[PDB]
Amino acid sequence: ATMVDSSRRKWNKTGHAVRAIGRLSSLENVYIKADKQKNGIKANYHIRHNIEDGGVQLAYHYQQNTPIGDGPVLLPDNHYLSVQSKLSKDPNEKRDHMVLLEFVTAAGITLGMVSKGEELFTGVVPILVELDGDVNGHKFSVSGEGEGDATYGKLTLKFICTTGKLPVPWPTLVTTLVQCFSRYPDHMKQHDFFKSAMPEGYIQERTIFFKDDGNYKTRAEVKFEGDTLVNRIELKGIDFKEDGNILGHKLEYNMLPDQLTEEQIAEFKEAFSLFDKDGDGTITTKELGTVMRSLGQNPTEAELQDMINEVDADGDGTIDFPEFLTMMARKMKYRDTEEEIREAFGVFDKDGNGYISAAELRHVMTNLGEKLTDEEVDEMIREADIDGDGQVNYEEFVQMMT
Ligand SMILES: [Ca+2]
Ligand SMILES: [Ca+2]
Ligand SMILES: [Ca+2]
Ligand SMILES: [Ca+2]
C-alpha cells in the first residue's frame, strides 16, 4: 500500500529529534550577567539572519549597560531573556519602514531556590526611538514611535528611515532599535536591572560582529523624558563588504506566519513523543538522557539540567509539551549553520565516511524507538537520493532536513 506516506512520517520524527537535540545543545537566548565594576550588567548572544537565497548570517553581540544615575540598582544573578520578534510592513506606508512586535520574558533560574523603578512600567508606556547611523561612510537616520507593556513583555514599534533608502537590512537593526519592557516572573523581579535603573535610565553599548563581514558599534541612552521612554542611539559600522550580505541587501525580511498549522503541531507532536517515553506531556532529564545515549552521546546530569534550562520557560526543570512547541517553532524559523548541519549528519554517519549508509540509518532509528523494516528504510534513502548512489551525502542530507 503506502510505505511512502509512513516513511515520510518516520523520517520527520527522527529529523526533528536530531534537530531538537542540536537546539538543546545551543545557546540561543540573551545571556545576562552582573558587572560589579560598572555597577551594571553585561550580555552576550547571537542573532540568525536568514540569507535570501538560502543560508544563515550570524551576528555575535556583546552588550554592556551602565546606569546614568548615582542611585541604587539591582545586580542580577546570571539568567536570560527569551525573545520572539515579528517584523511586518504597514500597507499604507510609502516610506522605507519597519513594524516590530516583540515578546520578551526572563527565565534561566529554576524554581528550586521588587524595585522602585518597576512602578513606572505597570501600564502601557509610550516609546520614542531615534538613531543616527554611519556604515562604511553611508549615513542614515531612523525615527520610531510605539508602546511597551511590561506586564506581558510586549513591545510594538514603527520605524521610518528619515534619510530615504536604508543602506543596511532592517533585520540588522532590530536589536539596536528597550529591554526594560521584558516580563520578569514574580520569582525573578530582583534580577531586573533595566527597570531598577529608571527614571534616570542606562547607557547601552554593543559591538555586533557579522561573521564573514563587518561590525556595528552602538551607544544608546535609554531614559524617561516625561512619561515617554526614550532610546537615542548612535551606530557606527566599519569593514563591510560592498557585495556582502549587509551592504548588498541579501537578507530575508520576515517569512513564516508567526502561528503553526494543525499539521506542523502534529509533526512536532510525533517528535515530542520520541522523548516523552511515558506519555505524561513532559520531558525529564532521565528521558533526555535515554534519547541522547541512544544517539551515541553520553551526557552528565548537569549537562541534561543545562539543556532543559535553555528552554524551560516555567523553571520546573522539565520540558513540557508547549515549551517543546515554542522551541521547535523557533528552530523552524531560523536557519542552521554549516557546522550545525555537519553535527546532525554525524549522528547518522557513525564511521565518519561522509556517507549515510542504509545500514547506519537503520541503527539510528532502532535505538530511538521505531520498528522500521528493510523495505521502509530503503524507501527513505530513495526519497532524497539525488545522485542514485544508494547512500545519503551531506548535500542530499541538507535537503532532507527542510
Ligand atoms: Ca515524560
Ligand atoms: Ca518546564
Ligand atoms: Ca557512513
Ligand atoms: Ca546519494
Residue numbers in the entry: 45 to 157, 170 to 233, 237 to 461
What sentences appear in the manuscript?
At the first stage of this study, we replaced circularly permuted EGFP (cpEGFP)—the fluorescent core of GCaMP6s—with circularly permuted BrUSLEE.
Indeed, the GCaMP6s-BrUS variant, while maintaining a relatively high molecular brightness, demonstrated an extremely short mean fluorescence lifetime with a low sensitivity to calcium. Under conditions of calcium indicator molecule saturation (Sat-form, 39 μM calcium), GCaMP6s-BrUS showed a molecular brightness (EC × FQY) circa three-fold lower, albeit still comparable to that of the original GCaMP6s. In GCaMP6s-BrUS, the phenol moiety of the chromophore is surrounded by a mixture of hydrophobic (V74, I91, V127, and V230) and polar residues (Y89, S129, E146, and T231). Some of these residues participate in the chromophore fixation via a network of hydrogen bonds, including E146 and V230, as well as Q263, R265, and solvent-mediated Y261 and Q238. In case of GCaMP6s-BrUS, the side chain of Q238 is oriented off the E146 and forms a tight hydrogen bond with the side chain of Q107. According to our structural data on GCaMP6s-BrUS, the side chain of E398 is oriented at the interface between the beta-barrel and calmodulin domain, so its substitution might influence the dynamics of the interaction between these domains. GCaMP6s-BrUS may find application in high-speed volumetric imaging, providing a potential two- to three-fold increase in the data acquisition rate compared to conventional GCaMP family indicators.
